[PDB]
Amino acid sequence: MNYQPTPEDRFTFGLWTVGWQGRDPFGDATRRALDPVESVRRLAELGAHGVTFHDDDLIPFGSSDSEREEHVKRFRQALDDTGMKVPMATTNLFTHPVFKDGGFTANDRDVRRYALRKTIRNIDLAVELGAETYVAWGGREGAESGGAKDVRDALDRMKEAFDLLGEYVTSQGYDIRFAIEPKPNEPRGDILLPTVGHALAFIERLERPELYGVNPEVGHEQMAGLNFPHGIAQALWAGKLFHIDLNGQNGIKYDQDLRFGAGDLRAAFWLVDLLESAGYSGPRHFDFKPPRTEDFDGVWASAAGCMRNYLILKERAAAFRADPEVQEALRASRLDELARPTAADGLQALLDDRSAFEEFDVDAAAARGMAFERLDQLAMDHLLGARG
Amino acid sequence: MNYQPTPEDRFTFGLWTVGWQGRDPFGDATRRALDPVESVRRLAELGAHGVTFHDDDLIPFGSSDSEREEHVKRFRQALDDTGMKVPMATTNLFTHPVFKDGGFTANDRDVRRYALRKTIRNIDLAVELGAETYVAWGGREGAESGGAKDVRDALDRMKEAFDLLGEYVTSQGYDIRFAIEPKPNEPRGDILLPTVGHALAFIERLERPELYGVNPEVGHEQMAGLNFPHGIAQALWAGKLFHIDLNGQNGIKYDQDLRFGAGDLRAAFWLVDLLESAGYSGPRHFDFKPPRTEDFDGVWASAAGCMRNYLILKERAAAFRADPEVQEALRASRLDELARPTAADGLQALLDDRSAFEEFDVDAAAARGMAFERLDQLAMDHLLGARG
Amino acid sequence: MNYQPTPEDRFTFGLWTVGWQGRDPFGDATRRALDPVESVRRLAELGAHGVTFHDDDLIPFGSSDSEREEHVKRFRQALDDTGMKVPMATTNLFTHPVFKDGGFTANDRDVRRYALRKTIRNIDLAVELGAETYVAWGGREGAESGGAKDVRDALDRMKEAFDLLGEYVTSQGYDIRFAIEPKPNEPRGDILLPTVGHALAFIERLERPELYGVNPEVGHEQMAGLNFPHGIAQALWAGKLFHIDLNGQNGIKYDQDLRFGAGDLRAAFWLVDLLESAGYSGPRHFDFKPPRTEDFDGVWASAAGCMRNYLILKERAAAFRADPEVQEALRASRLDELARPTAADGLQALLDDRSAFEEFDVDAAAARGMAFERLDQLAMDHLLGARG
Amino acid sequence: MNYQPTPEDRFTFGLWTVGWQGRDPFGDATRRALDPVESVRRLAELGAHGVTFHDDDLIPFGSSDSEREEHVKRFRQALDDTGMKVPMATTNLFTHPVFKDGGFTANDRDVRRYALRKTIRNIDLAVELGAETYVAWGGREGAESGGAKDVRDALDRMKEAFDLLGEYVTSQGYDIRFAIEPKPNEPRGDILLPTVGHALAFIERLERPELYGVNPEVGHEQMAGLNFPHGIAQALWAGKLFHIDLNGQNGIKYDQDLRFGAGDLRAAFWLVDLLESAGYSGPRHFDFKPPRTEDFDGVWASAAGCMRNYLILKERAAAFRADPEVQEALRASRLDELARPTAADGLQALLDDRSAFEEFDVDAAAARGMAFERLDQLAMDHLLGARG
């Protein structure tokens, strides 16, 4: 009947999401700032499993090591009092004007070195707070113009940065992995490693590829008009889905960061189906923004909404896969045959198989309908709770 | 002054481009069919270096082995008479209704086997005609609905197909490589391996990755709103640019297949800059369609146009890179620093470097302008021939 | 419980939708042709209220007046036997190669005259069959290049065409209205009057604007990334929604023509909400294509699907508006205040109103939250049938 | 040879463009604020004809009437010292949190009244400074969710607002016209009157339509994937192009506000061709942002760039239209026939014209090629300065 989250649902939220003040490129903040401790408490009450942070969300940029220890201890006490976990952390390499041309791939070499020292410092902090995943979103790595960035040199510099972080973590004996987060654009004209695919290909060029995976985001792939569930399947196929960011997006436009379930609802349905079917066991992280039209009550309603919509879709997709009429339709559409090897008999047997070519009745094959529309209307009926 | 192509320019054209009859989803053919021999002759006269083909462009589907030999011999004679080469060939796995749910990843296993036998047969033909690159465009590999295709099983089947083709080629001792051609959509709702990135990541999972690269297409990446020169740089960085398809596209919409230079002209400029700077030496292949508004004279004007616009951009980009004021602006924007290692001194030296963090003047760094707009206006002036 | 359509639901289908053979730009037909009589019969059995046609769907292009009368009489008998109506008809001005540069705005003046005579002929036929709406979709009116079409002269020619059709209809005393159907692109690079807005503005320039409205299509506005329910509201506001075409589209790409409810499901929900709330009483027309993966059984399943998804959304939107908790949330979000005049007191009273400016507490106003997220989660819960 | 602007070129700039501090949704300001007086002086030195402003650019929000008079007098002195004009002004109804749900169409009625009083106040100021055009950009008029805004009530409120402003201006005897500026999205999920078309249709519903036109922006129509030159032609056709905003945009994504000429260079070429050919005589206004990567030197280089690229395109388009080979190609493509009435002979003569139908040789018509590709390559050659 109802859809109450529990910390066993592994729902997590960034400090920066519910704490977004409402500043957009055309307007002033509409909400006062939130204390991180307050967020941890409110989220805990909503059923969340944990929070995530950028270094600058937790410790104001240019804090003395004294202020730093103080900010951390307060945070830690909030975690102890609530049972909230910190499964992921990340570095802000995009807000300060020093990162206007990027962090790891800034043309200025001294900014690149600074970016790495800022990162390493927060990796230590994240390990201490017990994070298992360290996310890297190269929001400023890119260009507005063709001549401003030689992309092969920038990829050299990016690989250099990630290889050095991999060296550091292995030298420290830390138990933490990296997840690269792609985005095609905004705030840069074009961002490097713009999609899950580009990030997966890149990783295979690092010195220790086993240390790195992807942190795809719903809205980000959709800003390229791509099919998010398909891209997630490729990441799963590659064994690289280390984390995931959930939100909603209405097509190709600025990054809207709507609550999860908003935006493309059928894509959310197929995403949940796949995560649950594949046994993804990492956090279900929400990287979203309550619209600036909202007051704090609207903020917590929006965050509750994220979790509620995941649990409703989870139920509907489970119902869909458990439905015997659906299982018969999957066989009718030959999903079972898709899962069988094309040619386990091997190359030579295939070459000698006259039924595969010389004697293949192509006209009869062509006439078989795939029965996909009936299957899809079953999926729709299950999504809408109209099964009868 | 003028811009005449020579076969040394390695400009190539698919039989299907100038031979497109003008059939689109809303309308009948506006042009009669072209004989392949006629195309080879006309293109040779225009300065082209070679042609490419799908098996079905050259031998009508369901031709007897007798008709087949006949079609090939005619073709071959045309090549001998003109000096035209065949550097690339590919398989049509998308036109016949038997491929309505795909070739290599069709749900029906017997269609998948047939698709592989059709492919292998044309690989032999391509080696004979001396092609060095075999292209695979999985135009029908994908779905219109979420339940119709389990994407992890489909990627298993795709890897299976490509691994078997790799086995075949190595067993035959052939000197030919594969290039996968991505496209995000059309004619399927969503196509598997939708961008260069996804194709690069995929290849790294094949049994013999060294046999496979990418054949990116301008219009295709732009249908995802992606930056084509950036994606090409990543392919070059990976050492995987085996071939390239040139055309024009006006943004995110149906695949327009405009002549090269049409569409996004600045992107074409930066693409040519990169190909010539990186020393890409493969064919410059045009995969485009003369608009159906045109008669055959318009067809050859459109094909001449492709080559002419490449040679004009080539000249302008060479002029841009040779310009001492541009070389000074690149230094002003610190492109030289981008090419230098961030930390050749290594991790420990970086960790002990107080100028990289403790003593880094972040406020002075932040105040340095990147001077990118002046550089870009220099690039614009060079493109428009307005340098003074 | 279930969702059975009746002819009172005014669901209509074009002959060309269920009769689409599956030819797309990359592939051959996958289905044999359907006899119009068979379609009328099958659709009648599915609960449809009527059918629509292009002149060329019903009478093969270049039919003798004898064949013509024969085709019509057969059709008519099918309508009599089933009770099916013909509420709308339209002209095919896009398939024949003579229309490759358009019909009403072709550069060649003799093609423009021919286009008008072909149109007028079918208007007579449509009046005879009792249609009340005549649709004009200028699918070929546009350009692939900047110089090919002077758009001001083309708009002159378009207005000329529509004014002449308006003269004809009034001179014949016919009781029929025109609906212009916009589309931003495909099959032309850019099509004239690309959105509902452009078509509405245009109409206001015709000699008898009262004779013309719009026939917006879901997928078409979404190919421009526009909000279809918003555009429909503007048409309703203007009193110009004469007809509507329903289907599904997954974002900005080629025109997918998916069954209604597929594509952007939340947009379909808000569209149905608005049509039913505004009391739109015209046909609910489906302009869609069963995917070419399907056989004829899949064809009729896809058409049934269109009607079923409308009736499910209709129920959910009615439930949403009837819900007292929703009506309280609408008041909380001040939808009631939106409907009240800003200044029924008039200009001078507003100018003398110190509470509107001098004494307006802007800081308190700014702090009121809009409560939109709670309202939207109520809408989501109602859509998913999760209200508790 | 070179391309120096003069105030006779009527190039204008908003205070907010060169004065943009570099704050984007992901980052802090990278540049200090500019004094309006300094901007007027620097722009005057660059050859600009005038500046424009939002009320809040010139007088800080919540300034005492004393501070106000002071800010204005300083501004005025700068204008007197430089000869700079103020042809357009506008209201900021989007930055202050009180406008988070819009100005003219905010759900809260007291915000709507406040929005109108803020507007009226600046209209007086603009008339005083001698502006001839008052621009309205409803940046916050829209919604992120379906239920938050009844679009028919919002259009009622929008018409109410504009009718009241029209009453005010006529009652004051002011010589000023309004230009509505459409944008499809950002910062709202969807914005009302999202394209030029929707704004043109809307105006026709106002009480005094003659007082209102459009202020289209390059990047805005391109964010909908629309053809900007086509939309501008429709506005010209309607006699409603009162002002225009020039900038550059790379496709469908966030509003990039690149300098003019950047983005889609061929579209800029065809836009300049049309403005100059149609005799548009209003300001050429640049609404753009120097990238935040830039220091103040980059700011002025970027602004110089806008004007330079217009003057280069102006020259190339003039050269194109003056070229006798182009004029012959226009005749070959029958642009001359497009400009002739389809049927000046009238309806009855057309109906009795057997050459228009009964005896029209459709097959010969269909075979005529349009010769559009040759024409377009001539346009390309002229744009690139490669004519020989």
Swiss-Prot record, chains A, B, C, D:
It is found in: Cytoplasm. InterPro entries: Xyl_isomerase-like_sf, Xyl_isomerase-like_TIM-brl, XylA_actinobac, Xylose_isomerase. Coiled coil: none annotated. Binds 2 magnesium ions per subunit. Its EC number is 5.3.1.5. It is an enzyme of class 5 (isomerase). The keyword Isomerase applies. Keywords: Carbohydrate metabolism, Cytoplasm, Isomerase, Magnesium, Metal-binding, Xylose metabolism. The active site is at residues 54, 57. Mg(2+) 1 binds at residues 181, 217, 245, 287. Gene3D superfamilies: Divalent-metal-dependent TIM barrel enzymes. Homotetramer. Belongs to the xylose isomerase family. This is Xylose isomerase. It comes from Streptomyces rubiginosus. The gene is xylA.
